[PDB]
């Protein structure tokens, strides 16, 4: 299967990404508390629902929340301001709150059923969000000996996500609040002066440079 690419809403960030975030891949956004990781996730949950000529994939969404940060009214606002129906957009997002890291791991395995269910409909699942990917593992696996044990369980969780991305042609997008890392692509996000947000690719020897965008009623835009 040819790769699909989901626009972020930022044409500069889309250029860094070669067109958008890719299916058959795990994209990690990481940065300090407050840098906009969850806003980028909200914006992507709408953009994927657009038709391809508008940067989407006519796709459904599955969202795993670990910090109670998902906001349906934010989804509806972004949808409305980009020309889509707010309730229809909300309807095509499946939502789960992970109670702990072990619940988080079972929810990903359980997601394969709905993915198969929607696969050959007109709105197959095209985006799987995990926000936050690491917060539960950080609180549960801590102290002497936890570095190896935590990285092992996290590697298996990420392996499960890679398999779903590749088997079913899905883009996986994960956040991490800031060690080896397993994601396909890592994006560093930070706040700038004057309400700007700045993104940069990490340890990706393609495009060099930084994208600068704002958080708006459309989600994000340059």
């Amino acid at each position: 299967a040819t790769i699909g690419r989901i626009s972020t809403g930022s044409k500069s960030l889309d250029k860094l990404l070669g067109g958008g975030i890719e299916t058959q891949a795990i994209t990690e956004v990481f940065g300090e508390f407050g840098s906009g990781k969850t806003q980028l996730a909200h914006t992507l949950a709408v953009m994927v629902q657009l038709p391809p000529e508008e940067g989407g994939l006519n796709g459904s969404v599955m969202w795993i929340d670990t910090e109670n940060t998902f906001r349906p009214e934010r989804i509806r606002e972004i949808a409305q301001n980009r020309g889509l129906d707010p309730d229809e957009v909300l309807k095509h997002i499946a939502y789960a709150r992970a109670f702990n890291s072990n619940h988080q791991m079972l929810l990903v395995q359980q997601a394969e059923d709905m993915i198969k269910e929607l696969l050959n409909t007109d709105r197959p699942v095209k985006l799987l969000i995990v926000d936050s990917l690491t917060s539960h593992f950080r609180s549960e696996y801590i102290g002497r000996g936890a570095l190896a044990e935590r990285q092992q369980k996290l590697a298996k969780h990420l392996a499960d996500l890679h398999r779903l991305a590749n088997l079913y042609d899905i883009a996986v997008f994960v956040t991490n609040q800031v060690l080896a890392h397993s994601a396909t692509l890592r994006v560093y996000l930070r706040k700038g002066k004057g309400g700007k947000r700045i993104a940069r690719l990490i340890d990706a020897p393609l495009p060099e440079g930084e994208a600068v965008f704002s958080i708006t009623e459309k989600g994000i835009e340059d």
């Binding site: 599955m62 309807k91 997002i93 499946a94 939502y95 929810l107 359980q110």
Partner: peptide, 4 residues
Amino acid sequence: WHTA
């Protein structure tokens, strides 16, 4: 899992 539930609908948003």
